């Protein structure tokens, strides 16, 4: 059918310093294969949803870096940061007056290692998105990740599962329990008819339902967005939605939240080193490291389990297990 | 009296990669106080020996980087690498026909932390350089350094000691024994009348005595140097010299052979971090490290005892105890 796709581009990606920049959000970083994640996302989506029917949501102040991507793709400029619920609101507004029968919502800052399997999962989500149902993407957990959201699965109904609950990021021990009980990772992707989300706004997110009505009725985006509460679509809607279906994706997938994600994404023997960037890695008696060299050379001698990331005249050195703490660096610099 | 000074500039300083360059030998690196070691050396020497009477020996292919230093100072361009014995040969040739009564020989790639005490030691060496005597500079060892040469001291005679033997770099355990027995570090500095070195060449280094005669007699530097054997003045002459005196310098001193030397030179609490360069060091839960940032920023998070050196688009990361192995990096790159 007539399906539109909303591609949400966001995230400062402070945990990915020095690669991330003020004017260069996470989605615009040259990572795997030298590609930005947004680049790989659009390429992966093209065969399923044409560019003409694709909406790229980004902050207003990021139009510059994003515009080069708007080739047939339309930019939806977010005046302020209002999370994904705000981006989804804008996507729905467009889908509605575009007459779309289906709206696909996806993040542009994730890694997917099988484009075909990714599309097949999305195709199935579109189908499972019958009257009333909101559909989510799930992934079998490979580790007790504490920064991800999980989804409870009910019995299987053909190509999908009945969604049976959404849980926010748990503690380490709680994540283990989620896994034992058959919980899967929330993949951040959703599929529904525009109307079903409108109705969901009405029931669990009044601010957005009212905003949606006024937008279609000629209200100013700036005005509307300013008075909107900042909330994710997962918490504002998904966790309260009564009719949810889930499709399990079996492709490799990572949110790429921190430098350590590079190692996970490579999916090789842990003790082997992981290198990205156009620069060269000189490794001498070095194991289990993650190295990013935008240019020049990076030499490591007799070290293990470290992240060494060089971009321009900035260098980071941190044990990969403490990758989350990289965000403090930007704090120190700002200070 | 009329004293000339020979300042030997040399050393690739491969152990100081990435700071060292093909066209930038050790002596020309911006290290302590942002100064090159040659810069600090010339400044330290000026009050004792004027620039007019100072000879700066450097390789022929390094004239470019050295010329800026030749302000009243004269360049002695070495056609090939023949060690210090070769540089000393050239220095003696000049001193002789310049009519110098004393020649002071010193390295330009060493750190000295007390210019006045340094000059006072040299002044004393000039005096102790009577007829027949070659004078050396000694320093009380602060650690069993295996890369330095040591000197055996005989009884004290006024302001100096009688030199009683020269030993090349020992093993770790042997260095400890040297220290127990009262051995001191060879500081690399020498003082003698030009004639006494000429006679020393004649007795223990025929190749250089003959070369010296021919040079004064109009032979071509290129020709002469090419057929000269490569040998240090310490091994070729000093270790065989029968009439040696030693002056003990009590200023802080390091040869700055590897990155770890930066820590030794700072001479602070070991656990504190050592930073050089114009760049900024963001330290989070970091201890006992040595950081060099030519520019931009260098952030370390939860690491200890590491050397992180960034110059241009090249970065080095190695535990400071393995600093000597840095030389392998250049080998890998050449390969």
XYZ file of C-alpha atoms in Angstrom:
670
model
C 0.000 0.000 0.000
C 0.897 3.670 0.227
C 3.474 3.590 2.975
C 5.468 6.538 4.268
C 8.651 6.226 6.293
C 9.788 8.535 9.074
C 13.545 8.451 9.659
C 14.437 10.007 12.994
C 17.895 11.564 13.027
C 19.084 12.692 16.452
C 21.425 12.180 19.391
C 24.543 14.314 20.175
C 26.433 11.063 20.656
C 28.611 12.538 23.397
C 29.719 9.028 24.299
C 31.299 8.923 20.842
C 33.617 11.894 21.429
C 35.966 12.892 19.736
C 34.236 11.611 16.598
C 30.988 13.396 17.396
C 30.738 17.165 16.995
C 28.442 20.057 17.946
C 27.430 20.450 14.319
C 27.784 16.729 13.696
C 25.269 14.540 15.531
C 25.652 10.771 15.874
C 23.768 9.879 12.663
C 26.288 11.853 10.622
C 29.458 10.087 11.738
C 31.659 8.054 9.346
C 31.753 4.696 11.119
C 31.279 1.217 9.617
C 32.572 0.801 6.040
C 33.335 4.537 6.194
C 29.577 5.163 5.969
C 27.477 7.388 8.216
C 24.722 5.451 9.987
C 22.081 7.624 8.303
C 23.678 6.783 4.963
C 23.439 3.024 5.574
C 19.880 3.469 6.872
C 18.595 5.280 3.784
C 20.263 2.758 1.458
C 18.747 -0.106 3.440
C 15.295 1.509 3.301
C 15.167 2.546 -0.382
C 14.094 -0.876 -1.763
C 11.190 -1.033 0.688
C 10.041 2.598 0.850
C 10.962 5.028 -1.943
C 12.768 8.305 -1.150
C 9.768 10.330 -2.296
C 7.722 8.768 0.517
C 10.482 9.119 3.112
C 10.595 11.838 5.782
C 13.887 12.707 7.457
C 13.364 14.338 10.854
C 16.268 16.419 12.198
C 16.792 19.463 14.394
C 16.366 22.882 12.815
C 19.953 23.837 13.576
C 21.175 20.685 11.814
C 19.650 21.432 8.418
C 23.095 22.110 6.968
C 24.610 18.661 7.561
C 21.318 16.921 6.774
C 20.361 18.676 3.544
C 22.782 16.666 1.340
C 20.682 13.617 2.309
C 17.405 15.207 1.140
C 17.499 13.723 -2.365
C 13.812 13.019 -3.014
C 13.671 12.549 0.712
C 11.847 15.344 2.516
C 13.303 17.095 5.576
C 11.087 17.522 8.650
C 12.856 20.188 10.676
C 12.213 19.954 14.416
C 12.299 23.478 15.918
C 13.258 22.099 19.354
C 14.247 18.803 20.913
C 11.075 16.986 21.942
C 12.297 13.396 21.687
C 10.779 10.789 19.371
C 7.177 11.433 20.451
C 7.565 14.888 18.984
C 9.206 13.561 15.808
C 6.469 10.920 15.505
C 3.836 13.659 15.863
C 5.267 15.468 12.838
C 5.532 12.238 10.866
C 1.883 11.429 11.513
C 0.761 14.899 10.471
C 2.438 14.459 7.102
C 1.266 10.885 6.562
C -2.328 11.875 7.265
C -2.613 14.715 4.762
C -0.474 12.701 2.368
C -3.156 10.021 2.581
C -0.720 7.354 3.747
C -2.161 3.978 4.752
C 0.951 3.034 6.698
C 3.702 4.874 8.525
C 7.018 3.250 9.346
C 9.084 4.887 12.101
C 12.793 4.173 12.455
C 16.029 5.486 14.027
C 18.939 6.460 11.805
C 21.634 5.902 14.409
C 21.500 2.103 14.593
C 23.659 -0.617 13.043
C 22.055 -3.384 10.977
C 24.166 -6.159 9.501
C 21.679 -7.649 7.020
C 19.748 -5.167 4.885
C 17.584 -7.815 3.227
C 16.591 -9.456 6.500
C 15.965 -5.946 7.838
C 13.578 -5.132 4.996
C 11.835 -8.495 5.324
C 11.193 -7.738 9.006
C 9.793 -4.288 8.175
C 7.619 -5.697 5.381
C 6.156 -8.100 7.915
C 5.556 -5.246 10.359
C 3.559 -3.347 7.739
C 1.316 -6.393 7.247
C 0.864 -6.987 10.969
C -0.228 -3.368 11.254
C -3.931 -4.060 10.769
C -6.756 -1.987 12.238
C -5.943 -1.007 15.812
C -2.496 -2.575 16.079
C 0.767 -0.837 16.668
C 3.743 -3.014 15.613
C 7.223 -3.072 17.164
C 10.551 -4.665 16.208
C 12.165 -7.066 18.636
C 15.600 -8.680 18.732
C 16.839 -11.683 20.700
C 19.249 -10.278 23.343
C 22.891 -11.394 23.157
C 23.838 -9.816 26.493
C 22.158 -8.339 29.614
C 22.251 -4.812 28.172
C 21.084 -2.300 30.784
C 20.691 0.683 28.438
C 18.084 -0.888 26.176
C 14.360 -1.199 26.569
C 12.871 -4.697 26.431
C 9.532 -6.115 25.281
C 7.457 -8.943 26.793
C 6.282 -11.428 24.189
C 2.960 -13.237 24.280
C 2.145 -16.294 22.120
C 3.140 -16.313 18.445
C 0.447 -15.551 15.858
C 1.846 -16.505 12.472
C 4.685 -14.179 11.445
C 4.568 -12.136 14.654
C 4.057 -12.179 18.416
C 1.501 -10.464 20.574
C 3.237 -7.640 22.413
C 2.660 -8.112 26.125
C 4.518 -5.223 27.776
C 7.289 -2.651 27.537
C 9.984 -2.303 30.176
C 12.507 0.517 30.397
C 16.227 -0.102 30.832
C 16.710 -2.454 33.786
C 19.589 -3.135 36.145
C 22.274 -5.714 35.258
C 20.608 -8.483 37.279
C 17.138 -7.491 36.079
C 18.278 -7.668 32.460
C 19.437 -11.251 33.034
C 15.977 -12.107 34.376
C 14.312 -10.453 31.365
C 16.362 -12.715 29.109
C 15.551 -15.889 31.045
C 11.837 -15.055 30.747
C 12.027 -14.666 26.984
C 12.139 -10.858 26.839
C 13.496 -9.255 23.656
C 15.244 -5.952 22.874
C 13.116 -3.032 21.671
C 14.528 -2.308 18.219
C 13.222 1.236 18.058
C 11.178 0.559 14.918
C 7.409 0.886 14.612
C 4.675 0.348 12.035
C 1.077 1.539 12.131
C -1.675 3.253 10.210
C -1.509 6.995 10.867
C -5.016 6.912 12.352
C -4.129 4.281 14.959
C -1.365 6.538 16.291
C -3.701 9.523 16.254
C -6.097 7.539 18.418
C -3.233 6.491 20.677
C -2.297 10.144 21.169
C -5.917 10.871 22.108
C -5.983 8.105 24.737
C -2.534 8.307 26.414
C -0.906 11.552 25.184
C -3.417 14.435 25.145
C -0.741 17.070 24.555
C 0.223 15.415 21.264
C -3.341 14.651 20.161
C -4.254 18.316 20.596
C -1.020 19.386 18.941
C -1.705 17.060 16.019
C -5.203 18.489 15.517
C -3.949 22.073 15.555
C -1.080 21.344 13.175
C -3.419 19.915 10.553
C -5.657 22.915 11.193
C -2.953 25.436 10.284
C -1.195 26.072 13.634
C 2.445 27.243 13.646
C 4.979 24.442 14.053
C 7.216 26.644 16.187
C 4.359 27.636 18.481
C 2.972 24.118 18.760
C 6.361 22.460 19.360
C 7.420 24.959 22.038
C 4.445 24.120 24.280
C 4.841 20.363 23.736
C 6.244 18.196 26.573
C 9.495 16.319 25.853
C 8.784 12.579 25.862
C 9.795 9.448 23.964
C 7.215 7.587 21.925
C 8.106 4.428 23.835
C 7.177 5.885 27.219
C 4.468 8.275 26.065
C 2.588 5.771 23.920
C 4.084 2.320 23.435
C 4.252 1.325 27.098
C 0.553 2.149 27.416
C -0.685 0.751 24.081
C -3.213 -2.091 24.475
C -3.050 -3.612 20.964
C 0.631 -4.303 20.182
C 2.257 -6.804 17.835
C 5.947 -7.684 17.624
C 8.118 -8.917 14.763
C 11.422 -10.581 15.604
C 14.340 -9.394 13.489
C 17.151 -11.920 13.088
C 19.761 -9.602 11.608
C 22.736 -8.313 13.589
C 21.761 -5.152 15.423
C 23.349 -2.594 17.748
C 22.308 0.881 18.843
C 25.973 1.930 18.716
C 25.602 3.861 21.977
C 29.326 3.926 22.846
C 32.785 3.153 21.477
C 32.572 -0.405 22.787
C 29.706 -0.976 20.361
C 32.276 -1.059 17.578
C 33.627 -4.302 18.966
C 30.152 -5.823 19.315
C 29.259 -4.788 15.790
C 32.348 -6.427 14.313
C 31.239 -9.713 15.919
C 34.645 -11.370 15.744
C 36.938 -13.011 18.328
C 37.027 -10.528 21.263
C 40.813 -10.657 21.625
C 41.264 -9.449 18.012
C 41.573 -5.671 17.532
C 38.830 -3.577 15.924
C 39.853 -0.729 13.639
C 37.798 1.960 11.888
C 38.629 5.205 10.144
C 40.926 5.844 7.195
C 44.037 6.044 9.354
C 46.410 3.142 10.058
C 46.714 1.036 13.216
C 50.199 -0.134 14.160
C 49.600 -2.884 16.696
C 52.465 -4.348 18.749
C 51.545 -6.913 21.401
C 48.070 -5.392 21.492
C 44.835 -7.284 22.194
C 41.103 -6.736 22.607
C 41.289 -3.071 21.626
C 39.007 -0.709 19.722
C 40.854 1.809 17.558
C 39.469 4.708 15.554
C 41.875 6.685 13.368
C 40.355 9.293 11.078
C 43.814 9.935 9.622
C 47.554 9.571 10.119
C 48.622 6.632 12.289
C 47.726 5.163 15.672
C 50.348 2.963 17.371
C 49.579 0.827 20.389
C 52.297 -1.084 22.187
C 51.671 -3.698 24.867
C 48.121 -2.716 25.827
C 44.781 -4.534 26.017
C 41.082 -3.761 26.255
C 41.501 -0.095 25.408
C 39.601 2.320 23.217
C 41.946 4.729 21.445
C 40.030 7.166 19.232
C 41.678 9.910 17.204
C 39.764 12.494 15.169
C 41.547 15.653 14.081
C 43.579 16.999 16.989
C 41.578 15.190 19.654
C 42.450 11.823 21.156
C 40.594 9.587 23.578
C 42.059 6.730 25.607
C 39.737 4.732 27.888
C 39.252 1.068 28.830
C 36.462 -0.261 26.706
C 34.494 -1.354 29.766
C 34.265 2.291 30.843
C 33.050 3.490 27.416
C 29.904 5.092 28.873
C 32.014 7.538 30.902
C 33.347 9.173 27.729
C 30.435 11.596 27.987
C 32.222 13.217 30.928
C 34.989 14.410 28.613
C 32.626 16.760 26.761
C 31.375 17.957 30.149
C 34.942 18.809 31.206
C 35.601 20.599 27.924
C 32.369 22.600 28.137
C 33.221 23.553 31.715
C 91.476 31.626 28.253
C 90.484 31.277 24.617
C 87.989 28.461 24.843
C 85.952 27.035 21.987
C 82.838 24.930 22.443
C 81.717 22.059 20.240
C 77.983 21.371 20.446
C 77.143 17.973 19.004
C 73.646 17.802 17.547
C 72.524 14.316 16.543
C 70.283 11.327 17.197
C 67.131 10.400 15.174
C 65.347 9.954 18.490
C 63.208 7.114 17.149
C 62.224 6.276 20.712
C 60.550 9.690 20.772
C 58.168 8.959 17.885
C 55.744 10.558 16.911
C 57.418 13.776 18.061
C 60.637 13.022 16.204
C 60.770 13.329 12.421
C 63.011 12.366 9.489
C 63.907 16.008 8.974
C 63.640 16.719 12.686
C 66.266 15.014 14.849
C 65.999 14.762 18.635
C 67.814 18.047 19.389
C 65.182 19.963 17.436
C 62.096 18.807 19.321
C 59.885 21.190 21.354
C 59.936 19.505 24.758
C 60.463 21.112 28.182
C 59.080 24.661 28.542
C 58.219 24.386 24.834
C 61.949 24.700 24.095
C 64.050 22.453 21.870
C 66.908 20.812 23.773
C 69.438 22.511 21.482
C 67.770 25.826 22.282
C 68.131 25.322 26.047
C 71.712 24.112 25.534
C 72.857 27.186 23.608
C 71.194 29.531 26.115
C 72.845 27.669 28.985
C 76.246 27.861 27.268
C 76.239 31.517 26.134
C 77.367 33.019 29.487
C 80.344 30.654 29.623
C 81.394 30.428 25.967
C 80.327 33.128 23.493
C 78.454 32.198 20.290
C 81.362 33.373 18.151
C 83.531 30.660 19.726
C 80.837 27.981 19.522
C 80.725 25.238 16.877
C 77.459 23.449 16.146
C 78.034 20.026 14.589
C 75.113 18.546 12.628
C 74.566 16.256 9.658
C 74.851 17.754 6.188
C 71.263 16.869 5.357
C 70.079 18.679 8.496
C 71.485 22.096 7.618
C 67.982 23.430 7.001
C 66.582 22.887 10.506
C 69.897 23.812 12.131
C 70.712 27.019 10.265
C 68.286 29.207 12.287
C 70.496 28.379 15.298
C 73.693 29.596 13.585
C 73.541 33.136 14.981
C 77.226 33.906 15.562
C 77.487 30.199 16.123
C 79.283 28.373 13.325
C 77.867 25.227 11.696
C 80.157 22.207 11.286
C 78.373 20.061 8.725
C 79.129 16.349 9.037
C 78.988 14.752 5.556
C 78.167 11.328 7.050
C 77.315 9.831 10.413
C 80.564 8.939 12.164
C 79.436 9.255 15.781
C 80.959 11.682 18.282
C 84.572 10.686 17.563
C 84.046 12.049 14.084
C 82.352 15.212 15.375
C 85.151 15.661 17.928
C 87.716 15.304 15.125
C 86.149 18.239 13.280
C 85.918 20.288 16.464
C 89.606 19.765 17.185
C 90.600 20.744 13.658
C 88.840 24.076 14.058
C 90.095 24.743 17.583
C 93.679 24.115 16.509
C 93.812 26.549 13.598
C 91.663 28.935 15.610
C 94.423 28.869 18.216
C 92.098 27.706 20.981
C 93.660 26.832 24.339
C 90.633 24.826 25.422
C 87.885 22.875 23.709
C 84.640 22.005 25.449
C 82.609 19.151 23.943
C 78.933 18.713 24.772
C 75.709 17.017 23.593
C 72.710 19.130 22.645
C 70.107 16.468 23.347
C 70.352 16.388 27.145
C 68.227 17.950 29.884
C 69.847 20.133 32.550
C 67.773 21.623 35.345
C 70.229 24.211 36.699
C 72.027 26.332 34.108
C 74.217 28.120 36.649
C 75.348 24.921 38.345
C 75.914 23.507 34.855
C 78.195 26.392 33.900
C 80.040 26.203 37.219
C 80.765 22.521 36.539
C 82.045 23.298 33.030
C 84.176 26.189 34.303
C 85.777 23.762 36.728
C 86.367 21.260 33.923
C 88.234 23.883 31.900
C 90.547 24.519 34.866
C 91.122 20.828 35.543
C 92.120 20.477 31.903
C 95.826 21.083 32.477
C 98.632 19.638 30.362
C 97.895 16.019 29.498
C 94.502 15.698 31.171
C 91.210 14.972 29.543
C 88.267 16.001 31.776
C 84.835 14.356 31.974
C 81.528 15.261 33.636
C 80.051 12.853 36.145
C 76.667 12.705 37.858
C 75.569 10.783 40.945
C 73.198 8.038 39.679
C 69.584 8.152 40.893
C 68.689 4.750 39.429
C 70.416 1.639 37.987
C 70.184 2.983 34.427
C 71.354 0.339 31.951
C 71.596 2.615 28.899
C 74.180 4.990 30.336
C 77.921 4.708 30.550
C 79.503 4.982 33.998
C 82.846 6.262 35.290
C 85.041 4.884 38.096
C 86.210 7.584 40.478
C 89.582 7.635 42.193
C 90.420 9.898 45.169
C 89.322 13.542 45.121
C 91.917 16.182 44.215
C 90.449 19.552 45.121
C 87.518 20.437 42.852
C 87.670 17.179 40.890
C 88.289 13.436 41.016
C 90.857 11.305 39.285
C 89.097 9.343 36.560
C 89.792 5.663 37.111
C 87.902 3.885 34.321
C 85.056 3.977 31.824
C 82.428 1.256 31.621
C 79.835 0.889 28.881
C 76.148 0.368 29.617
C 75.815 -2.535 32.057
C 73.025 -4.954 32.881
C 70.389 -4.075 35.512
C 72.189 -5.974 38.284
C 75.593 -4.704 37.163
C 74.355 -1.114 37.278
C 73.314 -1.625 40.907
C 76.833 -2.846 41.698
C 78.365 0.165 39.919
C 76.315 2.422 42.180
C 77.269 0.595 45.378
C 80.948 0.974 44.432
C 80.640 4.718 43.950
C 80.417 4.759 40.145
C 78.926 7.858 38.500
C 77.065 8.503 35.228
C 79.076 9.687 32.219
C 77.546 13.077 31.447
C 78.747 13.180 27.864
C 80.718 16.393 28.400
C 84.467 16.795 27.958
C 87.140 19.461 28.351
C 90.704 19.433 27.060
C 93.352 21.384 25.219
C 93.099 20.623 21.502
C 96.649 19.239 21.522
C 95.911 16.680 24.244
C 93.124 15.211 22.102
C 95.374 15.234 19.052
C 97.885 13.191 21.022
C 95.117 10.881 22.209
C 94.095 10.266 18.599
C 97.718 9.410 17.793
C 97.937 6.858 20.623
C 94.532 5.081 20.563
C 92.780 6.178 17.336
C 95.208 6.210 14.381
C 92.443 6.655 11.810
C 91.432 9.961 13.406
C 94.982 11.183 14.039
C 95.806 10.676 10.362
C 92.496 12.211 9.342
C 93.163 15.212 11.572
C 96.603 15.773 10.031
C 95.252 15.605 6.486
C 92.338 17.922 7.235
C 94.639 20.645 8.529
C 96.810 19.989 5.483
C 94.012 20.754 3.018
C 92.333 17.340 2.520
C 88.663 17.196 1.454
C 86.221 16.794 4.336
C 83.986 14.540 2.255
C 86.878 12.300 1.241
C 88.371 12.155 4.724
C 85.048 11.505 6.493
C 83.997 8.732 4.095
C 87.057 6.598 4.906
C 86.750 7.230 8.658
C 85.491 4.414 10.937
C 82.274 5.093 12.887
C 83.089 5.204 16.604
C 82.111 7.155 19.712
C 84.683 9.314 21.446
C 83.935 7.465 24.678
C 84.920 4.071 23.282
C 87.527 5.236 20.786
C 89.414 7.498 23.180
C 88.002 8.033 26.658
C 87.966 4.395 27.752
C 91.648 4.158 26.831
C 92.829 7.562 28.106
C 95.445 7.315 30.883
C 95.224 10.859 32.317
C 91.543 11.556 33.094
C 89.921 13.923 35.579
C 86.252 14.054 36.558
C 84.036 16.886 37.778
C 80.805 15.998 39.557
C 77.795 17.998 38.400
C 75.046 18.388 40.994
C 72.331 19.732 38.714
C 69.379 17.635 37.562
C 70.317 15.745 34.423
C 68.726 13.310 31.973
C 69.701 12.152 28.498
C 66.006 12.149 27.552
C 66.416 8.848 25.696
C 62.718 7.875 25.760
C 59.244 9.167 26.596
C 59.593 7.958 30.180
C 62.404 10.478 30.606
C 59.759 13.189 30.690
C 58.539 11.852 34.005
C 62.063 11.640 35.435
C 62.826 15.160 34.284
C 59.743 16.593 35.971
C 60.988 15.107 39.265
C 57.627 15.231 41.014
C 55.455 12.629 42.786
C 55.381 9.627 40.383
C 51.612 9.164 40.630
C 51.024 12.729 39.342
C 50.596 13.100 35.564
C 53.233 14.727 33.351
C 52.065 16.906 30.476
C 53.994 18.641 27.684
C 53.023 20.274 24.421
C 50.626 23.139 23.771
C 47.574 20.890 23.716
C 45.304 20.198 26.703
C 45.149 17.090 28.897
C 41.726 16.081 30.190
C 42.474 13.636 32.987
C 39.711 11.544 34.585
C 40.778 8.989 37.191
C 44.210 8.953 35.573
C 47.516 8.393 37.390
C 51.240 8.069 36.746
C 50.925 8.947 33.063
C 53.084 10.850 30.589
C 51.107 12.894 28.069
C 52.353 14.858 25.081
C 49.831 16.923 23.117
C 51.212 19.183 20.409
C 47.696 20.525 19.829
C 43.982 19.934 20.313
C 43.060 17.814 23.336
C 44.093 14.498 24.866
C 41.583 12.785 27.183
C 42.498 9.848 29.373
C 39.886 8.027 31.407
C 40.661 5.435 34.071
C 44.208 4.549 33.013
C 47.602 4.501 34.739
C 51.283 4.346 33.867
C 50.738 5.082 30.194
C 52.507 7.260 27.669
C 50.046 8.901 25.283
C 51.828 11.101 22.736
C 50.048 13.009 19.989
C 51.830 15.027 17.299
C 49.929 15.980 14.166
C 47.944 12.981 12.954
C 50.070 10.422 14.773
C 49.335 8.987 18.202
C 51.322 6.678 20.446
C 49.996 4.686 23.394
C 52.437 2.525 25.384
C 53.051 1.695 29.056
C 55.815 3.931 30.248
C 57.899 0.957 31.363
C 58.057 -0.210 27.743
C 59.140 3.216 26.421
C 62.281 1.806 24.768
C 60.162 -0.347 22.437
C 58.694 2.743 20.759
C 61.544 2.502 18.261
C 59.797 -0.530 16.768
C 56.932 1.675 15.596
C 59.175 3.528 13.132
C 60.488 0.147 11.987
C 56.931 -1.032 11.265
C 56.128 2.181 9.411
C 59.308 2.005 7.324
C 58.533 -1.619 6.489
